Point group: D2
């Protein structure tokens, strides 16, 4: 019949930080493709709510309460996922926080909280998952990075951007170490994506954000989930150590004047 | 997994061999009808016959991508055969070698003309039909050579592949109000019929310098193009995806050898 | 005494397209450092005016009328420069035009005019200069590229951006071929630089351009000349095939909102 | 050629050896007074004595870059010795090796702490003095490893070097109203005292994989930092300059071999 990509139905995934925002969208996109998904988070109430919301998906979404900055929780997460699903094929190293603080105000704890969730939590879940991902014979790691850091700057986010670029520096070497294991590791770099959190500002400001983007809208969490889904396919086995910016063209204009001359 | 592309309409320039034929076959397997272009009627005919069993219908238009009139003719004939046009794979590419001293104006124009001007002209000629589709997709076949790497003898080739990307970073902005996205696949070293004539020692040396330990397949490029063409990639534009098994990552063979 | 870089006094340079704008600034910066400079251009009146304006510089600025898109003129330029100066050490492949046209309006001639000056004219002057630059034992090629093409998009400039990215694709290979000749080749990527031409718009619009740039001003042609001067130094002999963006931070903000949150 | 930097005031973190000592010597030769930092008083003392004949005065402050209090102390002592502070070279860097499986939390924090947090803390502590100078300059010593390349065993090192750049792309915007620029040099393979203990075969193998055919010198990095520090580089900020002899350009040793 018609064939696009090979179905991922019945494979096993972890989405760290999966109870809300982009991570929830990644989880729902994989579950709609028939992949069983464990989402992680620190807040059991939020995890339970998201598991309930997603109860009708084809693949089964369940939760593990875990702190990505603790390697022992990362190992517990992988073990619990393998127990529930039977193995582990896909890790979406997604968990991310984005508090703001100008350079002169950032404390050591501010810097370590952001680097610890965003960067160390990516490393630790990949480390815990290596043996199972190797055993799968088609392991996939997708990292949720950002345009902020690798490409752009944004006042108040110099530690955030540092952490998102750190993920990429890490994976450019990790892809080489993981190639003999037949695991690929790539990152999605979201631009400005509409989430529950951004709903807490007015249409005025959201319209200003959209008008600065060539696509003329903020992205959806499904836009990120679908990019991660492509990297997870068998058909992406020759893509590794790489990045895909998903931003409706946000990084392209040199300024709003270039947008306006349209 | 993704919304079916069955029944949509695609052009793949330079589709009779190599990466283009892989792109064509990948879309045709997805049920997309595909017009491939090329200058060699025999190669086109051969590939049309080879792919006669695909779900989507693969047919050929003989056309020189360096000629805007052939580009307009290719689009018109595709709209006539299929009913419209959803996807343009601006793929045609040549890669003759010449050291900088040896490159003549004609050498430079032949490579810039096929690889860069032929991408611009097919996009230009397809603009109206792609706009009417409401979900238009352009996928450009670039290269790691030019945008990322250097390779002696390919300074004009690398220039033309980087030129494609400079073009589409602006084109993406001009095309966004028409709901057309434009993105590029940057292949590394892909096993094609031509590379299969090199001998196993040569292919083994090439593969051993790549972290994945093999050359890619033309389907690797076809499937990246297929992703960009999905409705689910509507928020991706002006962007690149390198499909190279890790080729660009090591600083040197010493890094590969540390594995 | 105090030593910064090794003096370039008495070396020999070509600046293509040097009668106005960035190229004039490159020429004046090299001439102030004691380098003799041949500027090229198609308009003898403009060349003569610039030679007159620069008559007091330490190094001597003179002109050759030549079309960068003609390899025979590129060879004549190199020969005339060697005749006037005694050799050739530095080539600034600068000539650039930037007409605007939307994608649906660009003709083959529009595309070839821009690719021919901006890209082919860079290749042809480097080709003509190779034997003399090799003989110098410290050859330098500096390419004037742009943020537009390599990094940004700007409606109406898709052929312009293509041509500026083509220069970089070319030089990433050229640097390898030229390394055994001890010639380096690098590019400056200017952002928005104030020139005679931009003076033909109002302070209103120029202020809007500056306000979109972290440095809070448009750049000067000396900013580009000084970057090219660094690449030309003996102290830059280990820099090759590379780029330096000179733009006051223009490419960094994700949008004007990031600038405004400052 | 450029405006003399004579009499200005610089800090070079990790200045007692390797690239940092080259940066220090290059600025001191330009007549800039330089405070180098390090944890090893003997190495600092040795380098201060070696450079006693420079035009600018090189002196040492013993300090751990991972400690913000030491960063504030380094700035205060530099302002006291020199009268102010014009230039910070955030250079300190370590590069222990460990495969991904073997890296402990402590391994990762040691490298992130020196290479990334130590860059942030010295910039933070210098903000006020750099602002008062009216022409403040920060130059970060990053690496091709992380931002560009991958090297087995250096995934935490590469992360920390890319982290520096993500930081300075925002820092550049925050610092611009203060007239401070911030830029990074990305060294390739540089001949240091440590690399000189490897044997000629090893150094020859490394050099043969680089288009320039040699390892760079610590002065190559020092002179790129010196350019960023000039008044003539005031319109350069948030940017990178790779100093690597072409190392990142070839896709593989085969490309180098075609020369
Ligand atoms: Cl990065
Ligand atoms: Cl490019
Ligand atoms: Cl480029
Ligand atoms: Cl980076």
């Amino acid at each position: 019949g018609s064939h696009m990509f090979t179905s991922l139905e019945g494979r096993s995934a972890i989405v760290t930080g999966g109870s809300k925002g982009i991570g929830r969208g990644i989880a729902e996109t994989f579950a709609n493709a028939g992949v069983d998904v464990v989402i992680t988070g620190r807040n059991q109430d939020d995890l339970d709510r998201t598991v309930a919301d997603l109860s009708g998906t084809r693949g089964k979404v369940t939760a593990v309460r875990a702190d990505v900055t603790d390697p022992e929780d990362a190992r517990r997460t992988v073990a619990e996922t393998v127990s529930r699903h039977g193995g582990l094929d896909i890790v979406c190293a997604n968990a991310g926080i984005f508090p703001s603080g100008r350079l002169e105000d950032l404390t050591p704890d501010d810097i370590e909280q952001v680097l610890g969730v965003n960067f160390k939590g990516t490393v630790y879940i990949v480390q815990a998952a290596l043996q199972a991902l190797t055993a799968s014979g088609h392991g996939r790691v997708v990292v949720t990075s950002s345009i902020t850091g690798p490409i752009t700057g944004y006042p108040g986010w110099s530690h955030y951007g540092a952490s998102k670029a750190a993920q990429l520096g890490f994976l450019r070497t990790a892809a080489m170490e993981l190639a003999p294991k037949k695991i690929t590791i790539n990152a999605v770099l979201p631009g400005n994506i509409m989430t529950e959190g951004l709903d807490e500002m007015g249409q005025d400001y959201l319209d200003q954000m959209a008008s600065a983007i060539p696509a003329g809208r903020l992205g959806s969490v499904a836009d990120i989930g679908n990019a991660a889904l492509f990297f997870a396919t068998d058909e992406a086995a020759y893509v590794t150590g790489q990045t895909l910016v998903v931003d409706g063209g946000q990084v392209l204009p040199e300024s709003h004047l270039a947008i306006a001359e349209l």
